[PDB]
Amino acid sequence: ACIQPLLEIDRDSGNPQPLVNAQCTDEYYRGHSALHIAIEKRSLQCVKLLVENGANVHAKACGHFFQKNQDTCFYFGELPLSLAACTKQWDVVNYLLENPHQPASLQAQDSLGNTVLHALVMIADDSAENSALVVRMYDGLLQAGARLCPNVQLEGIPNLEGLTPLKLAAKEGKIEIFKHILQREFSAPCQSLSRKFTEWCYGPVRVSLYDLASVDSWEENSVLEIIAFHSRSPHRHRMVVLEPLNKLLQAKWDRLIPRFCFNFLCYLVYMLIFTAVAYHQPAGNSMLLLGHILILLGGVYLLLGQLWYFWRRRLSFMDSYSEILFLLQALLTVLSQVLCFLAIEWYLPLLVSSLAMGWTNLLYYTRGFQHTGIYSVMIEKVILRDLLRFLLVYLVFLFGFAVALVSLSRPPYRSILDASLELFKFTIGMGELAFQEQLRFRGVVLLLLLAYVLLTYVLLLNMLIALMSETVNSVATDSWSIWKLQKAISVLEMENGYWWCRRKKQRAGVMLTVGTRPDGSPDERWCFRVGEMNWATWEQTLPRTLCEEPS
Amino acid sequence: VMIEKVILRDLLRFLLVYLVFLFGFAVALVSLSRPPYRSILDASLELFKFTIGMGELAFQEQLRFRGVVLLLLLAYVLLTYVLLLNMLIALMSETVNSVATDSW
Amino acid sequence: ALVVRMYDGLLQAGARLCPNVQLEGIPNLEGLTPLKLAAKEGKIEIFKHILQREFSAPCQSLSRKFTEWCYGPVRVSLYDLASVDSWEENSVLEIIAFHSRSPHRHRMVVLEPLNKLLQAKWDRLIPRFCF
Amino acid sequence: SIWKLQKAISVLEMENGYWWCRRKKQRAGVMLTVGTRPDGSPDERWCFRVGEMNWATWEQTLPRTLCEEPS
Ligand SMILES: C=C(C)[C@]12C[C@@H](C)[C@@]34O[C@](Cc5ccccc5)(O[C@@H]1[C@@H]3C=C(COC(=O)Cc1ccc(O)c(OC)c1)C[C@]1(O)C(=O)C(C)=C[C@@H]41)O2
């Protein structure tokens, strides 16, 4: 009851700065206002009453409680309409849009650049209860924006990074709203906000068109490039399998199979030349000088290509494993030929080390096939995860027992390294244990060898059952989707061209008139066709088609 | 039935990967060792003996580059243990997620 | 469900009949209140009930879980640490750790007021562990 | 959870102190007034703050709060 007479009193006194537009002053709670409180407390009547007296509906609540990544904070954006949208209050959003005094604007964006659609992207994590809220409020705000301001396209407005809500949902890793936005069908009042159409439906077969406005890799800063090279989430291999993306990447791979085979044969010919030059090193001196020159050129080529990769689209151990191994082999090759040109005589271990490393890098090209590509994915995952803690524990046990046997044996076990070598021979199955008959302390040496053998059998058995428990309690589609993500990164690399000659890339998909716009010229969109077959289509209603007869 | 399905499916890609690793390391040891490892075949035979459990490794004390030979042998042993471990868990991922009526 | 229903009913009835006496303070001859007994004997369901307990308008002081504020979906909930804290002698944490003999000890450490408190102790004691 | 129990035993042992220096232990959590008792003075309890995020809060009934603004 006290609100209306108090505002009448504050208007009667004649202040220069009003009471109803009041901002909190603290650093933790800066810029907060009574309108944010009224929207938080779910009271529509107090919102109407504060609006009619003249509350600022674009008040930017920029406090430290209202920022993104601080602990136990609520990031809704700054504006009141973004708060009303995030807090599931539909009638408050409706009144704030359609009031006669001081209308809230959908184009209005916060200090971080985010509009209300970006905020609805940011709040989503995972549930039915969060996801249904976010998709319903997203669709409702788009339809309300088409009603109130038809010329503005609300999904075009970017953040301060330069991202639209679709690119933001791709980067932050939100699967549910990204999957909703890519395939979105609207009805007869406003159908031009759709991204999915049906071109024709002759019986059970039909042809669905998908829009590729920001999805195609032809335009810079795509969705495909953001999933491949800019997203940091562990959701990245799941987002590649979705409905317009899988067929598009399969089409690009089927276009680019010949260049993959050509790059394979070029690398194989390089490694055979490098093998013959490292074998015949020790007339023929002319052919060996030509061979050394070709190896130096190949090393400079691979080194510059990998440096251009790391400069261009990076800034990350498991994701960039292949590029690291190619970089090490290239640097060791160039360094070894520099030392052979200067004759520093240490060129031969670097030469054979880069030779072995270059032959074992031939498993990069086994990702063209599924049957062996998933196998090399598993080799990466075994080397990076499960081998290193085993080596940690094993080297602790090994050098503890080595120093014990060196110091207890006062010709057997002369030094720490020569005792480590015999204790490592026990692991292979080549090591010798016996009753020495010359040492004074024979029984203790034999007891320590028996204990070492039992402990390392325990360690190997543990490693095996740890891998079995990790693999048997795992989803089958994960290895398949990691392989698909590797192919997607590979096809986006082959599309960009070689480093010495940048390629002129082409659009994908046909250009056709999808409909009429609200104003003037008809809607003209680049679309990608996916054929579909469904046998329950006789029950549901027939959708509107762009064409009549299948072509 | 299981013998045929093990031979045709699992063993051949393992042999592919293993022979790539094997002959890469064999040519490296032949060229690095300037009486040990006299030829490509005679060094491939020793690196294959390491898989049986019969293979001899030592600090050679006559070659100039002893430590690099020892380091390459240690790396070969770890990589082949990784490959056999992978083959085993790949068969277990095929066999755990299968219907029991199918072999019958 | 029987034990939690009758436990709450007895607390409300004793709060009505004899208000000054607190029933949950009276110890056994072993020295234990019912929360320490539920922690010691290994009973997960009633221990989990007592640690997060909310009562209503007639008898509100019998709760052990309070909400300090709720701004939208976020809230800060206040949990009482009367016998849970390791400052006092013969705690619930000491009884779960040492004096319990059940096979259910490791399941009782993961409960909602305990997980955050033990993480907040471990993040403070990291440097002495490295030392 | 077995590993969490191991860290719990470790943090109790480090909190108790060494044998040669019996360390003085400190209370955890803030002390604040929760409400009034049925007899006389208000209740002052030592409490531990746990933050939570819940999107089912709108359909349910709103609980009693001890403070007004999030501070
Ligand atoms: C960067 C890492 C992690 C790495 C660099 C080198 C030292 C490496 O040893 C490891 C660790 C290691 C050490 C000792 C024995 C085995 C493995 O594994 C690779 C790394 C592991 C091997 C095995 O080859 C692979 O990893 C398969 C592979 C290669 C290239 C790829 O692009 C690839 O992608 C699928 C997979 C290659 C080596 O370079 C090699 O052949 C020699 C001489 C040593 C290998 O270190």
Numbering used by the authors:
A (entry chain D): 132 to 413, 427 to 459, 464 to 558, 586 to 726
B (entry chain C): 525 to 558, 586 to 655
C (entry chain A): 263 to 393
D (entry chain A): 656 to 726
Task: Share the article's original sentences.
TRPV1-TRPV4 are non-selective cation channels which play important physiological roles in sensing noxious heat, maintaining cardiac structure and maintaining skin, hair and bone physiology. A distinctive feature of TRPV1 and TRPV2 is their permeability to large organic cations, such as the cationic dye YO-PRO-1 and the sodium channel blocker QX-314.
These include one C4 symmetric and two distinct C2 symmetric classes refined to 2.9 Å, 3.3 Å and 4.2 Å, respectively. However, the TMs of TRPV2RTx-APOL 3 exhibit a slight departure from C4 symmetry in the pore. The effects of RTx on the TRPV2RTx-APOL are particularly obvious in the ankyrin repeat domains (ARD) of the two-fold symmetric TRPV2RTx-APOL 2 and TRPV2RTx-APOL 3 which display pronounced broken symmetry and a range of rotational states. Instead, RTx only effects changes in its immediate binding site above the S4-S5 linker and in the parts of the channel not bound by amphipol, strongly suggesting that the polymer constricts the TM and prevents conformational changes at the S4-S5 linker and the ARD from propagating to the TM domain. The fact that the TRPV2/RTx complex is stabilized in multiple distinct closed states with different arrangements of the ARD assembly suggests that the conformational changes in the ARD might represent low-energy, pre-open states that can be achieved without substantial changes in the TM domains. As observed in our previous study, RTx assumes different binding poses in subunits of the C2-symmetric structures, both in the amphipol and the nanodisc samples which may lead to the distinct conformations observed in these channels.
